[PDB]
């Protein structure tokens, strides 16, 4: 039971294997988050192929790095 799988699911609403990592960060305004800006830049650096889609791996390197920005989403989750 993992909590970055509800999150990366949340957005997953078309049965994919990714999630649009571009929509996320222009999302998160209404989840009440104050990083929106910050999530932009740092969203980019789990993405490999810079495409507006981030799969496990990729959306997980984003926990992983302890960037201050899931720390507060995970905890909406
Ligand atoms: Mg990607």
Redesign the pocket.
């Known amino acids: 039971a993992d909590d970055m799988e509800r999150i990366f699911k949340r957005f997953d609403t078309n049965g994919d294997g ?1 999630i649009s ?1 571009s929509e996320l960060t222009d999302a998160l305004r209404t989840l009440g988050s104050t990083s929106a800006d910050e999530v932009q830049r740092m969203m980019a650096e789990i ?3 810079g ?1 507006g ?3 496990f791996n ?1 959306f997980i390197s984003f926990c992983n790095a302890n960037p201050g920005l899931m720390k507060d989403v995970a905890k909406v989750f």
């Open positions: 990714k990592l993405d490999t192929d495409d889609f981030i799969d990729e």
